[PDB]
């Protein structure tokens, strides 16, 4: 494509730094931009990067190397709100406004440090049908990877971070469910390397 972005995705610890890159072959590109798209929203311009050198706006610094048409974005002290899809976009010079050419984007995920981990797998029963349940793997730290199911009849979500704002408490969780006759929470996350001390209530 005309604009090539890297990396494809990036996980960044809260408070950590991130660098995104954008290269292009088309020397007619004159006006470069960084756009951000939060889930379910339209893209929103973060900042233009039209001039050779650094452009600092708070925690964000865009940089353009006009000679090589290298564009970058550096994020300091990364925040949860920074998790989003980041696009490089460019257009040519013309008296008349032009359509933007976009890179494929980098999905940036800023993950929390779990100060007080308490990894556990709980069984939760359907409020209308107590015979039906899901398994909730929760409260693990950032070092735990939740692997996808290797069993087509077992469904396992990716991890999700929730934020109990008033308590300044964040926690990771993933959910697993199945109608398999022998499914049990004790075995739901067998395809993942989970903490040896994970709590499994009787």
């Amino acid at each position: 494509q005309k604009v090539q972005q890297s990396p494809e995705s990036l996980s960044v610890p809260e408070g950590g730094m991130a660098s995104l890159n954008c290269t292009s072959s088309d020397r007619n590109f004159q006006y470069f931009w960084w756009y951000r798209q939060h889930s379910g929203e339209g893209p929103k311009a973060l900042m233009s990067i039209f001039s050779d050198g650094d452009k600092k706006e708070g925690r964000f610094t865009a940089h353009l190397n006009k000679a090589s048409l290298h564009v970058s974005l550096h994020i300091r002290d990364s925040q949860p709100s920074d998790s989003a899809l980041y696009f490089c976009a460019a257009s040519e010079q013309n008296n008349y406004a032009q359509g933007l050419t976009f890179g494929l984007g980098t999905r940036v995920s800023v993950f929390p440090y779990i100060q007080n981990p308490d990894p556990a797998v709980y069984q939760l029963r359907d409020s209308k049908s107590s015979d039906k349940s899901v398994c909730l793997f929760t409260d693990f730290d950032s070092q735990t990877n939740v692997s996808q199911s290797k069993d087509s009849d077992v469904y396992i979500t990716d991890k999700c971070v929730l934020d109990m704002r008033s308590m300044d408490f964040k926690s990771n969780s993933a959910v697993a469910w199945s109608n398999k006759s022998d499914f049990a929470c004790a075995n739901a996350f067998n395809n993942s390397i989970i903490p040896e001390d994970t709590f499994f209530p009787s």
């Binding site: 311009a45 556990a120 939760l124 109990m164």
Partner: protein
């Protein structure tokens, strides 16, 4: 900040070979109007722009099947006809002031799903799973889980309502749905969400929790001849009460 670009409808399903019109309300005093197409929730492509009553630029992707206009006082519109499976995408409208250097302001997008046949369209079933006594005892917190299952296409919005008002704190919803039968090209989907509250809040029989799933389905104009209820745009919910 300031006025936002608006788009109608947020979601649309259409039968292959028909006509669809997507509507955009640009920032009031902007001069340039654009359409873009986003594929698979990532790749973004320019289609066309419009200035002083006429199309200006258009990409190789702006087909003869496409038309745009903006009658005075009316919406800026993109019309597609005849639709094809490949036209399935999220279409974003944008607007800007004068200049190739001008910031382009984007709308929220319209997700257009073109289907070979509408018989595959299904609304979600929804269930809420109550917090575990073990979690309450262990952490003094209480996690509810909502599961939306069996829907197609992937046209849902999930929200949590506590005592009749929507909540965002303590919520996390999967950014992507799972395919229930990943081998099938028309597989139905499942989506989960969590809402976590203090044990003290859950351990109260007067506190009410509802998971709401807005489904965007068939239109009044869409034909339906099957026995099951026409799978129209609708809300499906599940609920739980706290327990002392």
């Amino acid at each position: 900040m300031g006025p936002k670009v608006l788009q109608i409808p947020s979601h649309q399903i259409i039968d292959m070979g028909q006509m669809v019109t997507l509507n955009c309300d640009p920032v009031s005093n902007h001069l340039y109007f654009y359409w873009y197409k986003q594929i698979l929730g990532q790749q973004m492509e320019f289609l066309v722009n419009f200035y002083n009553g006429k199309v200006m630029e258009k990409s190789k992707l702006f087909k003869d099947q496409f038309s745009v206009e903006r009658p005075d006082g009316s919406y800026f519109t993109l019309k597609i006809q005849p639709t094809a499976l490949e036209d399935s995408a999220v279409y974003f409208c944008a607007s800007s002031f004068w200049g190739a250097y001008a910031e382009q302001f984007f709308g929220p997008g319209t997700r257009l799903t073109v289907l070979e046949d509408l018989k595959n369209v299904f609304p979600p079933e929804v269930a809420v799973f109550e917090p575990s006594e073990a979690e309450i005892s262990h952490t003094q917190k209480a996690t509810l889980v909502c599961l939306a299952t069996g829907f197609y296409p992937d046209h849902v919005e999930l929200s949590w309502w506590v005592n009749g008002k929507e909540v965002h704190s303590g919520v996390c919803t999967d950014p992507q749905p799972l395919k229930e039968q990943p081998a099938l090209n028309d597989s139905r989907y499942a989506l989960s969400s969590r809402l976590r509250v203090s044990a003290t809040f859950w351990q109260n029989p007067r506190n009410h929790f509802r998971c709401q799933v807005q489904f965007y389905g068939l239109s009044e104009n869409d034909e339906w001849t099957q026995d099951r209820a026409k799978p129209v745009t609708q809300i499906v919910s599940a609920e739980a009460w706290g327990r002392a």
